[PDB]
């Protein structure tokens, strides 16, 4: 009666293992990037699993679970992206066998879920603390962890920007988690990687003010979440259509309101008005908006509400959907609010400094073109994430799956001492580890088998007298050229996988 679930579980774990296997080639920088013609019949070229797994995906629920599991490592660490995909089927290689071997699905789950903690705990033994208080060290280590990886390009410049933006919003010496919540990443078309820089107040969409002063200092930050307009028929001017005097007189209706509705805007008063996009509005009366800025309130219109949401928190400008909601509290207090059309091309209102909770940072990402902007972002996103991970994880760990080649030995060793039905599992649990760096030893090219086998003894010796060194792609100290990562991406990939593998065992 529980046959079909096993069959389903087979069908699950099969298509589970399946989609996770294809990346095990593209796993790593030496992992080979696939130009993929899609349902669109058009090429798509990527290396990391997540993008690959999303950009062409059909629907298998376990596969759908893994693209999340993929996304998980992303949304979790922003880091170690390709890794979590590889461990799942590796674990399932143990699981499916153990399931074939007959180990009850609930067992293998709590087997590997218990065995999880033992792995990352020996990882905490493997873990090497670096200073989360020292910006330099973070500037030194994270970039080196980024230099364990591909991009130093703008990073080695933008890690001075990344580590700082983080350091600036870093309160603790621990530097804690620090999601990018207080780091506002905005671009600017013109400018440079050098004109990319951190700014201490929230840069606002363009500056949209018609008669609104180009700069107002000490800015009450108004927010308009309500329409500027008198009722519509065929325009902001409400038009009943027969003869043109009615639509001329209903103006007296329409005109006075959009004036007074504005007069009401300046009653409480605002130095800046946050106004989201007019399609994030039903519509915004220019008639008002004219006389609005003609009462001299500097404004930004056309801004994302999520900007506003970012702005409602980070500078604490409380959401204003209404004129009762016009209040010095819901009207945010900016130290300085200006616009800079310059230092590169494009126009943006610069809030520079403000009344802000949780520090705040905006980085305005510039460059000779959008791409120079784009990779700069891709230069920080890693730095942005690897720091916030490395600070999220007090210590650091060398990369290349060598800690797993260590740990696969470590747990299998104790998995003996563990004994229990799960000894067979917890060994096979750890045994799942070394396949991943093996695949890299295959992905960089090497014997994935010969080497990682020997590394388990290398990692039985100094635990690193050798590791998997990506540029060498072979038996090497990964501390001689640092191949190094925050503890999380290790933990992250692990803690995700088992859970994702866990419920599937418990899934019928």
């Amino acid at each position: 009666d529980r046959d079909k679930p096993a069959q389903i579980r087979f069908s699950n774990i099969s298509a589970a293992k399946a989609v996770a296997d294809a990346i095990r080639t593209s796993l790593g920088p030496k992992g080979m990037d696939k130009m993929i013609q899609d349902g669109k019949g058009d090429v798509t070229i990527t290396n990391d699993g997540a993008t690959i797994l999303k950009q062409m995906q059909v629907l298998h629920p376990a596969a759908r679970m893994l693209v999340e599991l993929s996304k998980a490592q992303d949304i979790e660490a922003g880091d170690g992206t390709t890794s979590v995909v590889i461990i799942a089927g590796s674990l399932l290689d143990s699981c499916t066998k153990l399931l074939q071997k007959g180990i009850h699905p609930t067992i293998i789950s709590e087997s590997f879920q218990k065995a999880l903690e033992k792995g990352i705990e020996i990882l905490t033994d493997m873990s090497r603390p670096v200073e989360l208080s020292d910006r330099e060290t973070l500037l030194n280590s994270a970039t080196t962890s980024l230099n364990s990886k591909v991009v130093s390009q703008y990073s080695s410049l933008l890690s001075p920007m990344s580590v700082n933006a983080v350091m600036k919003v870093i309160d603790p010496a621990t530097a804690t988690s620090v999601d990018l919540r207080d780091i506002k990443i905005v671009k600017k078309l013109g400018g440079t990687i050098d004109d990319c820089e951190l700014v201490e107040g929230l840069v606002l969409t363009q500056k949209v003010s018609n008669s609104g002063i180009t700069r107002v200092e000490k800015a009450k930050i108004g927010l308009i979440q309500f329409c500027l307009s008198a009722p519509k028929t065929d325009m902001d001017n409400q038009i009943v259509v027969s003869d043109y005097a009615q639509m001329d007189r209903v103006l007296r209706e329409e005109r006075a309101y959009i004036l007074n509705l504005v007069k009401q805007i300046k009653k409480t008063g605002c130095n800046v008005l946050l106004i989201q996009k007019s399609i994030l509005r039903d519509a915004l009366s220019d008639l008002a908006l004219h006389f609005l800025n003609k009462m001299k309130i500097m404004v930004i219109k056309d801004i994302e509400r999520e900007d506003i949401e970012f702005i409602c928190k980070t500078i604490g400008t409380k959401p204003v959907a209404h004129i009762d909601q016009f209040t010095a509290d819901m009207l945010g207090s900016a130290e300085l609010a200006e616009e800079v059309n310059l230092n590169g091309s494009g126009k943006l209102l610069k809030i520079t400094g403000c009344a802000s909770p949780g520090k705040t940072v905006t980085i305005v990402v510039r460059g000779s073109n959008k791409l120079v902007i784009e990779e700069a972002e891709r230069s920080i996103h890693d730095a942005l994430c690897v720091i916030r991970c490395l600070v999220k994880k007090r210590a650091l760990i060398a990369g290349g799956g060598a800690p797993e080649i260590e740990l696969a030995l470590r747990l299998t060793e104790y998995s003996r001492t563990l004994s229990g039905m799960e000894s067979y599992c917890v060994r096979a649990f750890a045994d799942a580890m070394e396949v991943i760096p093996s695949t890299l030893a295959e992905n960089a090219g090497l014997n994935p088998i010969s080497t990682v086998t020997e590394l388990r003894n290398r990692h039985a010796q100094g635990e690193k007298t050798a590791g998997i060194n990506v540029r060498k792609g072979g038996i090497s100290n990964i501390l001689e050229e640092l191949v190094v990562q925050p503890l999380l991406v290790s933990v992250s990939a692990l803690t995700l996988a088992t859970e994702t593998v866990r419920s599937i065992l418990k899934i019928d």
Partner: protein, 509 residues
């Protein structure tokens, strides 16, 4: 039309019920393992649940017998407050049990009549399996805690349950007059973690009128009210408003103000320190209430309005049929308080101490709404466990008790009944199998052990499904409130028979 006659309809009575059993039994207990929920209307969209009620919907039920049990599930789920996935496979077991036997030519008449008193035969044993726990209050504390984590366990909260296992019993701990879903005020509000879930001792308005009305009023005389301060409800003072002219907008504006000012002054004639309006409160009155030093809460939550009235001991305005005649709530403090991230107007000093406002703190609402939902489920048991403070040894232990009881009663009764009654007594012993099979442990071992245990009459020793061994039922927590089983033992021991009565099934579709 299309008549499904006995055998086919019985196999059809089987197809859903038996196969519906497959999942809900696979999810039975915490080590009960989940079924993927495939949403065939919404994408393939996948959901993973330990609960059968959620299963009963996503993929709909054609099978009438299974369609029947969806009621029974929900019935038992809602009424018992627990036993959702349980009572269902319980109907699957006996129908499965009756399969070969009615396929052995045995009449359901023979069958039903056999399981009838067999169902009752478990009762006296169940009524004997009734173990009074909670008779003492320290018992009742641990007694609630016994079943506190019990209900939420198979209701698919595996994380913050412990935090609620402590919370839910406290609100239930104070009641003691009766299990109370009204005096107890249920609030779940975002902010804080789900282990930050809070208990306001008193009434709570998750409303906040802010400083628009006075925020802090001590020894506040409450007006619990439906009384409209804009809409201006009945006992209306004036002519029926009318517009005969272009400029007529003025008088209707001025006419309502009096009508508003009346109910202001009239409720200012309560002397109430805080005005709680189940409707809104307009600008003219609220600026009058605010100038009256009175907190005017507008559009306050309907049951809470009564809960306020209840727990603060006050009365509700009765749709302003009582102009001054509505009695007044008095709580020693009315304070808008920040619990979690949000300001809520908290009423402490309310006339009911048994009353507790549990304020559930969402890290997100999707767990938070699931939190109280499943959290409210233990309350049913707990409320009825307030009323009957009693226990039954869980983990299939009372099963094995009622098993032997009917298993001997099979040999004690015997006949066309023991034809059925043995099949019955097997489904009794089939429950310990599932959780152990869910736990992936040897049932025939743990059953026949627990059989030998209840053949030695040990119901204080049972299958302990945490580690999934046979072990004590000392009320380790593995023991259940007597309410659940007698409830759960019922409907499927009924419906399965009830399903055996329908034989000719005419489906006109």
């Amino acid at each position: 039309a299309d008549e499904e006659r006995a055998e086919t309809a019985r196999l059809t009575s089987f197809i859903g019920a038996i196969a519906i059993g497959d999942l809900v039994k696979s999810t039975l207990g915490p080590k009960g393992m989940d079924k993927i929920l495939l949403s065939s209307g919404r994408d393939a969209s996948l959901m993973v649940t330990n609960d059968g009620a959620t299963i009963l919907k996503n993929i709909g039920v054609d099978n009438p017998a299974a369609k029947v049990l969806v009621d029974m599930s929900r019935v038992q789920d809602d009424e018992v407050g627990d036993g959702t996935t349980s009572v269902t496979v319980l109907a699957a077991e006996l129908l499965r049990e009756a399969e070969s036997l009615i396929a052995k030519k045995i009449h359901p008449q023979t069958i039903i009549a056999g399981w009838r008193e067999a169902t009752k035969a478990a009762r006296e044993a169940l009524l004997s399996s009734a173990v009074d726990h909670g008779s003492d209050e320290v018992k009742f504390r641990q007694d609630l805690m016994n079943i506190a984590g019990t209900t939420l366990s198979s209701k698919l909260l595996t994380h913050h349950k412990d935090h609620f296992t402590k919370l839910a019993v406290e609100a239930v701990l104070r009641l003691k007059g009766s299990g109370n879903l009204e005096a107890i005020h249920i609030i779940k509000k975002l902010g804080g973690s789900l282990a930050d879930s809070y208990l306001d001792e008193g009434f709570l308005l998750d409303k906040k009128i802010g400083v628009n009305q006075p925020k802090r009023i001590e020894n506040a005389k409450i007006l619990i009210a439906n009384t409209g301060m804009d809409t201006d409800k009945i006992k209306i003072f004036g002519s029926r408003v009318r517009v005969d002219s272009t400029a007529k907008v003025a008088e209707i504006e001025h006419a309502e103000k009096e009508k508003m000012k009346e109910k202001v002054e009239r409720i200012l004639k309560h002397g109430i320190n805080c005005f709680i309006n189940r409707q809104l409160i307009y600008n003219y009155p609220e600026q009058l209430f605010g100038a009256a030093g009175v907190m005017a809460i507008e559009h306050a939550d309907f049951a809470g309005v009564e809960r306020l009235a209840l727990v603060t001991g006050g009365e509700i305005a009765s749709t302003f049929d009582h102009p001054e005649l509505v009695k007044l709530g008095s709580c020693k403090l009315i304070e808008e308080v920040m619990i979690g991230e949000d300001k809520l107007i908290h009423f402490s000093g309310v006339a009911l101490g048994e009353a507790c406002t549990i304020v559930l703190r969402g890290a997100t609402q999707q767990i938070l709404d699931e939190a109280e939902r499943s959290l409210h489920d233990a309350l049913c048991v707990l409320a009825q466990t307030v009323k009957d403070s009693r226990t039954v040894y869980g983990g299939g232990c009372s099963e094995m008790l009622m098993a032997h009881a009917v298993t001997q009663l099979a040999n004690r009764t015997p006949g066309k009944e023991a034809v059925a009654m043995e099949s019955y007594a097997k489904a009794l012993r089939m429950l310990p199998t599932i959780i152990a099979d869910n736990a992936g442990y040897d049932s025939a071992d743990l059953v026949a052990q627990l059989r030998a245990a209840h053949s030695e009459g040990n119901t204080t020793a049972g299958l302990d499904m945490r580690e999934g061994t046979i072990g004590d039922m000392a009320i380790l927590g593995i023991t259940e409130s007597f309410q659940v089983k007698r409830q759960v033992l019922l409907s499927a021991a009924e419906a399965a028979e009830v399903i055996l009565r329908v034989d000719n099934i005419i489906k006109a579709a």
